[PDB]
């Protein structure tokens, strides 16, 4: 170990970069999309449109 | 087979080269996120203080 | 087969290095969660006391 404190790193002996990486990639993206969509489905916290919320105005 | 690279173990060193980068970039990403999150807050403070009725 | 890694195993030491970290991070996660719950409480106190009628 190049000046390490933990064994942490041994995880990659057990687990495989390729799979972890490909997985995170999907995961993060889906969640990303989800939130964006969700937000822009609302009234408050939609950027992209005229303030639909009619917040008090009418 | 008496090792981790036990008699031609098929190409994965004790590489914590990967660990290093993995963990850095995982932090960077979360850190960026924090900063970004803050900025958005200033544009749209999203939680909102508790209203006149509620409880 | 008369050992722990008995006659050329596919390999797991007595690694409880894993056990160490696993427990740490499990507690950290739960700790963080506690603090976070406390913070939110102050934003939106979620249970409520028992109302005028109830029972």
């Amino acid at each position: 170990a190049t000046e390490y404190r933990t064994a942490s790193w041994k995880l990659w002996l057990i687990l495989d970069p390729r799979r972890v990486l490909t997985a995170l990639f999907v995961y993060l993206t889906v969640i990303a999309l989800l939130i964006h969509f969700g937000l822009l489905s609302t009234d408050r916290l939609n950027w992209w449109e005229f303030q639909r919320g009619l917040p008090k105005a009418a | 087979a008496d090792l981790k690279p036990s008699l031609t173990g098929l190409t994965e060193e004790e590489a914590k080269e990967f660990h290093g980068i993995f963990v850095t970039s995982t932090v960077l990403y979360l850190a960026t996120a924090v900063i970004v999150h803050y900025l958005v807050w200033t544009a749209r403070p999203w939680i909102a203080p508790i209203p006149k009725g509620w409880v | 087969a008369d050992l722990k890694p008995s006659l050329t195993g596919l390999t797991e030491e007595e690694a409880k290095e894993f056990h160490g970290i696993f427990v740490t991070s499990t507690v950290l996660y739960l700790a963080t969660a506690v603090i976070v719950h406390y913070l939110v409480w102050t934003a939106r106190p979620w249970i409520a006391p028992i109302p005028k009628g109830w029972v």
Partner: peptide, 24 residues
């Protein structure tokens, strides 16, 4: 504006640190 609304900061931030520190 973020006034005692540190809530998202707490959630996002805290892990960020111990993620940094536990796996050094």
């Amino acid at each position: 504006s973020d006034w005692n609304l540190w809530v998202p900061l707490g959630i996002l931030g805290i892990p960020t640190i111990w993620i940094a520190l536990t796996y050094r």
